[PDB]
Specification:
Chain C: InterPro entries: CRISPR-assoc_prot_Cas5 (IPR021124), CRISPR-assoc_prot_Cas5_N (IPR013422), CRISPR-assoc_prot_CasD (IPR010147). This is part of a larger assembly, with chains A (493 residues), B (260 residues) and C (241 residues). Chain A has 493 residues and is of the alpha+beta class. Chain A is built from 15 helices and 11 strands. In chain A, the strands form 4 sheets. In chain A, strands 2-1-3 form a 3-stranded antiparallel beta sheet. The chains are: A alpha+beta (493), B alpha+beta (260), C alpha+beta (241). The structure holds a DNA duplex (13 and 21 nucleotides).
Chain lengths: 493, 260, 241
DNA sequence: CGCGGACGAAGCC
DNA sequence: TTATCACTGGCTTCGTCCGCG
């Protein structure tokens, strides 16, 4: 019979902090056990990883450190585990000992992260090409990402199938898909992924161990909860997705909006067909903000995670990752709990370094770009001053930058009574990141004064240099020169 | 054996291809922005003349039919470089207004005010074709003859169709240089990495500049490359480019003959 | 063994991590790209073991960083529905929706000098001199500068990029020296990116991560060339000797 | 009467 | 001095309706 154990069968790429040669593929158990020896384990799809780090954080929280002066007891228990440096393998095999038969992805009953009843009531298989990302599904245009005619498709290996699976449970097309009659009701319509189009932020250490431990969000006191893959019950598609105060409900793993089924190859080496289909009809609000994402409120008062953006340079978001101030956005709770000195770790904070997964795509089923971003290491009153410099910097920076946008745009119009904005921003941000990074490290940057609280209008000189680099050849005819300079004067501040 | 062609085709005030906005595509090169016509656009035009004139050498010479499913040969052994202007070019805005024919008891409140961008210049075009893969894939050497000869003349004659009804950009290349090279393909693009200065025209000056670059590269690498070039001017000699030919089809004939 | 490559030309684009309509290039050459170009020069069919190319080293000096531009790039627009790009289902979509709109990015006016150092790099140079398929910088449409290989054979090429290879014109203050140039080392800011190509098979191209270290280095100001047309002369002078 | 082609149903404010 | 300032599209599966043969 086809079987594929996630704990045993290798699928997580792993490079240790040692040797730094030949990264080896490991299963989930072997990875989770040798965490202290390996530096990191990765998968090529940032969405897949964006949910992966959630799965590992939840699992290691359920093994150690759940439910629970609750705050001081959590930070104390937290301090012991961070100081000890190694989880005992017997508690991992004891945590898996409760769900030993449940981690098969092709299990006859209760398949991993799947719905077994979906195989019936679904006359047409979606196909591997409809599940995996970057693979042209049935009606898509075939042009890019390898041509796949949806006729005799080469079956994915199971590991990559797990990656694309995790992606679909996270980000998933909100469009209508294959229909499933459930007790007479067939609405082939499918909802959107729970965190579709946001960049997840997981902090890192020197190995996966302490990183995964800092990944654990603080569970507020409430009802004990359990994940979708930890549910003894098989979900009923109709009804309300009941709320969940437990950490498995705020780690977005209590139930996923989509539902995938993978048809196994006789050996279990490949996936041959797939079914992606709706699991719930009426959408309900999930309690509490996702600790990983940066939230932000725009007029109308809507609290929403800032949608990723391929165009934006990442560094500005990193500034938001800091607070005790509020710059118009709510922000991320895990970062707030995890990194300030009120917490408890002594030194790991000095060497921790933040990582970002951002899959920016349509509000529908269209997709444009994903990206990872292992940004350096960043961390009271003295610290408050360093953050204050960072804010007053990112502020002056984008503010004058967009003012240069309006400038360029308007300029070209009033001239002609625009091609300048695109190239303007390209050189601008490309030239602007290193100047910012010099400001944060308090290094000397021309037009900027080291160790002065004020911004120093350095970005004025950068934007002016970029502006002249773009508009140079068109300040030629006297009229256009008049408009272009009279709008360049505004960047002088 | 690679046969590559360099041309210095000029285009009057035109907007053959354009961005998502109205402005033409531009490559900032040598510190000076310079208009370009992307490679795929000109290549698609070439594909239509070659296939029209031929009445599967098109899936061989060019990579793969756009409307056909991949037939295990997606590559083509033809490499079109993006044409770019020899000199720096400011995008020249053309303000235009659509006229309303029926007139009310008011005057001239025209139908549509707008401004569209256009540009003109002497594009340095370039392409190479890998004969060896073409022979190995097509089989018959004569099919290779018609494919390369007919492809070459097509390379010269065609011009993309974009905003052409408003601007008649039809033209013939001023300089063509086909160099049958056995070592490796070489583009003379860096000859124009320093945009030429203006006010007197560029055809002659660009010709002689390309001559200097050909002289020097041939100096660094003396080779058995069979060369030849044809121009619409008889006033200036370009010894580095090979023997002169009276006309373009004569040249193409001599070089296809030279390949076999 | 080892030799100096110069990745130059009007436009280049060493993209990665983009698998949809928008393509994007890294501001730095990637290892996958250069390995694939050498593989094209040697006739490595798509899917053949590329392990031979493993064990190579790529120190890359950025002369001019260049300005990256967004090339708008539609495919199939303006053609009758009957001849448009096929569907996976097989039915051409309606002509009002049949045009694909890719927005491919590319680096323009950027020049890097990668110093490939390895065990057999001399044979790959022997292949660049007479390539099996045309080498290109990222997208095949981009055509390499004729000076693709500055020196066929060099003992310790990184030392020769650190000095004695000209660089493009930049501000040289009076009585100044030691102009800053960013070298990119593989081992010893920094970024993590998916480059090292495990396989080039068109059916399932897969990669693994390679750490890239960005080292601001100090090179003699004498290398910087004069403002106009001297740079080509200096490069050629270097190439012959 | 059969077949082919085209538009709509959301998800979304 | 006054009037004028375009559209269209590059999402998802399938079903139904309509035009055709």
């Amino acid at each position: 019979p086809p079987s594929f154990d996630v704990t045993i069968a290798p699928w997580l790429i792993a490079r240790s902090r040692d040797v730094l040669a030949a990264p080896e593929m490991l299963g989930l158990r072997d990875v989770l056990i040798r965490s202290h020896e390996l530096s990191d384990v990765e998968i090529p799809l940032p969405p897949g990883a964006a949910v992966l780090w959630r799965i590992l954080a939840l699992i290691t929280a359920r093994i150690t450190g759940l439910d629970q002066n609750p705050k001081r007891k959590w930070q104390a228990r937290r301090s012991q585990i961070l100081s000890k440096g190694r989880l005992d393998p017997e508690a991992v095999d004891a945590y898996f000992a409760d769900y030993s038969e449940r981690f098969d992805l092709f299990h006859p009953e209760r398949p991993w992260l799947q719905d077994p009843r979906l195989r019936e009531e679904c006359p047409k298989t979606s196909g591997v090409n409809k599940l995996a990302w970057g693979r042209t599904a049935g009606e898509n245009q075939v042009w890019l990402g390898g041509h796949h005619h949806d006729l005799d498709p080469h079956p994915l290996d199971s590991a990559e199938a797990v990656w694309h699976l995790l992606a679909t449970l996270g980000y998933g097309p909100s469009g209508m898909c294959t229909a499933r009659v459930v007790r007479g009701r067939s609405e082939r319509n499918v909802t959107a992924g729970p965190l579709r189009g946001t960049v997840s932020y997981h902090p890192l250490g020197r190995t996966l161990f302490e990183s995964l431990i800092l990944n654990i969000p603080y569970p507020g006191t409430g009802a004990a909860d359990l994940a979708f893959w930890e549910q003894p019950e098989l979900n009923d598609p109709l009804g309300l997705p009941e709320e969940s105060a437990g950490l498995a409900g705020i780690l977005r793993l209590d139930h996923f909006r989509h539902a995938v089924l993978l048809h196994p190859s006789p050996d279990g080496s490949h996936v041959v067909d797939a079914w992606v289909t709706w699991a719930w009809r009426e959408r309900n609000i999930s309690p509490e903000l996702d600790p990983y994402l940066i939230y932000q409120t725009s007029k109308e008062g809507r609290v929403y995670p800032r949608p990723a953006e391929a165009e934006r340079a990442i560094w500005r978001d990193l500034d938001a990752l800091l607070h005790y101030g509020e710059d118009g956005n709510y922000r991320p709770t895990i970062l707030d709990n995890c990194t300030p000195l009120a917490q408890v770790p002594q030194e790991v904070l000095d060497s921790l370094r933040l990582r970002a997964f951002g899959f920016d795509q349509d509000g529908q089923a269209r997709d444009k770009q994903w990206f990872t971003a292992t940004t350096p290491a960043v961390l009271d009153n003295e610290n408050a001053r360093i953050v204050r410099r960072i804010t007053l910097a990112r502020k002056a920076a984008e503010a004058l930058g967009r003012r240069l946008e309006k400038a360029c745009k308007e300029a070209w119009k009033e001239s002609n009574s625009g091609p300048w904005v695109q190239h303007g921003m390209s050189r601008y941000w490309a030239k602007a990141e290193p100047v910012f990074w010099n400001i944060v490290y308090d290094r000397p940057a021309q037009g900027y004064t080291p160790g002065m609280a004020g911004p120093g209008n350095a970005f004025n000189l950068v934007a002016l240099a970029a502006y002249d680099e773009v508009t140079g050849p068109y300040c030629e005819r006297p009229r256009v020169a008049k408009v272009v300079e009279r709008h360049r004067s505004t960047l002088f501040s | 054996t690679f046969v590559d062609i360099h041309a210095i085709q000029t285009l009057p005030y035109s907007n053959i291809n354009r961005d998502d906005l109205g402005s033409p595509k531009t490559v900032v090169y040598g510190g000076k922005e310079r208009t370009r016509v992307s490679s795929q656009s000109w290549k698609r035009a070439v594909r239509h003349e070659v296939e029209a004139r031929l009445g599967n050498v098109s899936v061989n010479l060019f990579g793969r039919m756009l409307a056909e499913l991949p037939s295990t040969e997606v590559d083509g052994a033809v490499q079109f470089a993006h044409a770019f202007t020899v000199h720096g070019t400011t995008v020249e805005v053309d303000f235009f207004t659509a006229v309303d024919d029926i007139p009310k008891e008011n005057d001239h409140g025209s139908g549509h005010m707008n401004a569209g961008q256009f540009s003109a210049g002497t594009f340095y075009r370039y392409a190479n074709v890998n004969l060896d893969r073409l022979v190995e894939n097509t089989g018959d050497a004569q099919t290779a003859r018609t494919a390369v000869a007919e492809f070459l003349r097509a390379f010269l004659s065609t011009v993309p169709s974009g905003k052409q009804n408003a601007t008649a950009a039809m033209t013939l290349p001023d300089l063509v240089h086909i160099a049958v090279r056995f070592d490796r393909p070489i583009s003379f693009a860096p000859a124009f990495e320093t945009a030429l200065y203006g006010s007197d025209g560029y055809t002659l000056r660009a010709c002689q500049e390309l001559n200097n670059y050909a002289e020097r590269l041939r100096e660094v690498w003396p080779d058995d490359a069979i060369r030849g070039y044809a121009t619409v001017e008889n006033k200036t000699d370009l010894a580095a480019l090979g023997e002169r030919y009276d006309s373009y089809p004569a040249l193409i004939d001599a070089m296809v003959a030279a390949a076999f | 063994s080892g030799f100096l490559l110069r990745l130059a030309g009007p436009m280049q684009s060493w993209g990665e991590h983009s698998m949809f309509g928008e393509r994007d290039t890294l501001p730095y050459p990637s290892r996958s790209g250069l390995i694939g170009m050498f593989a094209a020069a040697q006739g490595v069919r798509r899917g053949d073991p590329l392990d031979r190319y493993k064990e190579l080293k790529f120190t890359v000096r950025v002369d001019r960083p260049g300005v990256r531009l967004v090339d708008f790039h539609t495919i199939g627009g303006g053609l009758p529905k009957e001849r448009t790009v096929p569907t996976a289902a097989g039915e051409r979509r309606d002509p009002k929706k049949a045009t694909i709109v890719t927005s491919r990015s590319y680096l323009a006016d950027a020049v890097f000098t990668v110093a490939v150092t390895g065990p057999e790099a001399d044979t790959i140079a022997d292949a660049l001199a007479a390539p099996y398929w045309q080498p290109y910088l990222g997208r095949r449409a981009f055509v390499p500068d004729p000076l693709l290989v500055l020196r066929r054979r060099v003992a310790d090429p990184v030392r020769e990029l650190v000095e004695a290879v000209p660089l493009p014109h930049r501000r040289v203050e009076e009585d100044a020296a030691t102009v800053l140039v960013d070298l990119i080392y593989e081992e010893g800011t920094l970024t993590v990116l998916n480059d090292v190509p495990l396989s080039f098979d068109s059916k399932s191209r897969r990669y693994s991560t390679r750490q890239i270290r960005v080292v601001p280095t100090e090179v003699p100001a004498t290398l910087v060339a004069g403002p106009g047309r001297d740079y080509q002369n200096k490069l050629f002078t270097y190439v012959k000797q």
